[PDB]
Design a protein around this ligand. Structure first.
Ligand SMILES: Nc1nc2c(ncn2[C@@H]2O[C@H](COP(=O)(O)OP(=O)(O)O)[C@@H](O)[C@H]2O)c(=O)[nH]1
Ligand SMILES: Nc1nc2c(ncn2[C@@H]2O[C@H](COP(=O)(O)OP(=O)(O)O)[C@@H](O)[C@H]2O)c(=O)[nH]1
Lengths: 311, 314
């Protein structure tokens, strides 16, 4: 409590109020903050939402720290969030940045739950006046698609070498990308290496059909460590925002995303009621085991689960 | 209902009439009929799974019906029994001429359900019945408009994408989401002469891009091939590549592993379809569900508030 004061404080720009709200996001504490979000929904959405991914070691934290510091220096308020699978189990300079709000990936039993708390945290930050939301993720199962469905622009960071030199990435990320940035383009030979690799990705991306006629994903080279190409990278993100806002496509994407998250939440309530209940959790596991083990057909397993939903 | 023990025998004996009967019973409006079929399937489960399951997709007009008709006919001539199953999202609302007359083929349209998940899950059950009846090749095709590509990929062992022969400025391009699903790209309409030169030119562009974009050392590297479904070119080679995939991924256990993941997916799909039935069961709940979706879609209420409203209705 009390939720009327918290809201007025949040909308004013109060960091402790944002912190408090985020903390709430206990079942009755969860629910209180959801009514708050519905109430400030009209003051959300005035932010550029960017998803960022890439292989461990590519330079995500380094690049985020460098870009976020450029952005705060230019007068933005930057929220840096995360969707990390490891949360179900240091960007040093941005931390000291009072105009940045870093939040580690929230704890939750499922990746759906991690995704759900992050989307909540994002709307809270927007209501609090943050105008850039960066969402960091790693390529684990479904997290990349989840983050691409949470943001306006999905940035994929790549090591400076394609084809035979690729490792540790899921193929589909090239289709989620609104831009590929090849990192480690350090003065000298790094520039040549990264540029060679960018030219290959550029040639390859030509076979993938862009989802919008309004935007053809660029391939750029950057050095997050040495601060090369970062302003040009951001300029492309701003270009995308401008062009797709003009056609109504940012709004359009956001609406689709919202209805997707609505249905995903319904299925999430359902599942964790079946998995939480000391009454039916074992029966649910037994049905999944019978199906996965080929003892009973998928439909037979669904039949057993139906009875548990009865009760 | 008929005697289900006789029906089971006839099905396992490979009787095509029994298969169609079991399918008709699955499509019945009576729940008690649909239940009998579910029990039959559980009973014949140990006799299922000895088939190559292939998903096939491509844009309308690429020549999918023609290619399936041709390939299906080669396979039945080679001693196989072939089922062709469609998956179409318009099954949730509201022509292969030679194979249609082939006694060793079994063709069925997309089953009705409330959700695409439901349609696909009912397709998996149909696939099990076909396999129990001795069908050793199951072709599952996407039909109409819709994004049923993922559903068809998650129903099968191998996902084949058919593409148009355009090259250079006329290259078709791979649609978003298909690149990560494709186990092979076949450029169709490689007719003798100009057509096959365009198809080979397109294949070379796809092959070069795929090399750049595909991390090495996967068990299987998706090939790019050219075919003509209409003139019967490249189909035996295309099939040998699918048999190669089966061998390689059977040896690593990857085919069994994927089928396990899929089966659990389809179980949960059926659970969700049943809860969707609840939300569209009467005019009043249908309208309430629509109003929740419209509120979230219009920015008036948050996703969580819409989800609250839905959960309540059930
Ligand atoms: N040479 C070079 N090294 C970099 C660059 N960006 C990051 N690194 C280094 O790459 C390693 C991984 O960086 P980090 O940001 O932690 O990677 P992350 O796991 O993707 O978040 C560290 O040693 C970084 O200092 C760059 O642009 N050039
Ligand atoms: N020239 C040529 N035409 C083809 C080939 N395969 C299919 N077609 C034609 O392309 C049109 C669409 O074929 P269809 O099989 O119905 O395509 P679908 O909509 O993808 O199922 C028809 O006129 C076919 O005759 C081919 O290999 N060569």
């Amino acid at each position: 409590p009390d939720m009327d004061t918290l809201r007025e404080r949040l909308l004013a720009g109060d960091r402790a109020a944002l912190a408090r709200a985020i903390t709430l996001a206990r079942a009755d504490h969860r629910a209180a903050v959801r009514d708050l979000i519905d109430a400030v929904l009209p003051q959300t959405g005035r932010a550029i939402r960017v998803g960022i991914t890439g292989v461990p070691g590519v330079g995500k934290s380094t690049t985020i720290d460098a870009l976020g510091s450029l952005l705060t220096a230019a007068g933005h308020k930057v929220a840096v969030l995360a969707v990390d699978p490891s949360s179900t189990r240091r960007m040093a300079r941005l931390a000291i940045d009072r105009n940045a709000f870093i939040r580690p990936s929230p704890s939750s039993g499922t990746l759906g739950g991690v995704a759900a708390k992050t989307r909540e945290t994002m709307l809270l930050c927007e209501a609090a006046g943050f105008d850039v939301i960066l969402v960091e993720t790693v390529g684990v199962g479904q997290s990349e698609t989840a983050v691409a469905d949470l943001t306006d622009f999905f940035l994929v960071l790549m090591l400076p070498g394609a084809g035979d030199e690729l490792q540790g990435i899921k193929k589909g990320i090239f289709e989620l990308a609104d831009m590929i940035a090849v990192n480690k383009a350090d003065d000298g030979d790094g520039e040549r290496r990264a540029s060679a690799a960018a030219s290959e990705y550029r040639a390859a991306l030509h076979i993938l059909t862009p989802p919008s006629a309004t935007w053809t994903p660029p391939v750029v080279t950057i050095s997050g460590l040495h601060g090369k190409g970062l302003d040009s990278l951001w300029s492309r993100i701003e270009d995308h925002r401008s062009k797709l806002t003009a056609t109504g496509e940012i709004a359009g994407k956001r609406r689709e995303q919202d209805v997707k998250w609505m249905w995903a939440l319904v299925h999430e309530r359902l599942h964790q009621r079946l998995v939480g209940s000391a009454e039916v959790r074992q029966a649910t596991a037994e049905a999944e085991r019978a199906v996965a083990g080929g003892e009973h057909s998928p439909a037979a397993g669904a039949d057993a689960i139906a009875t548990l939903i009865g009760l």
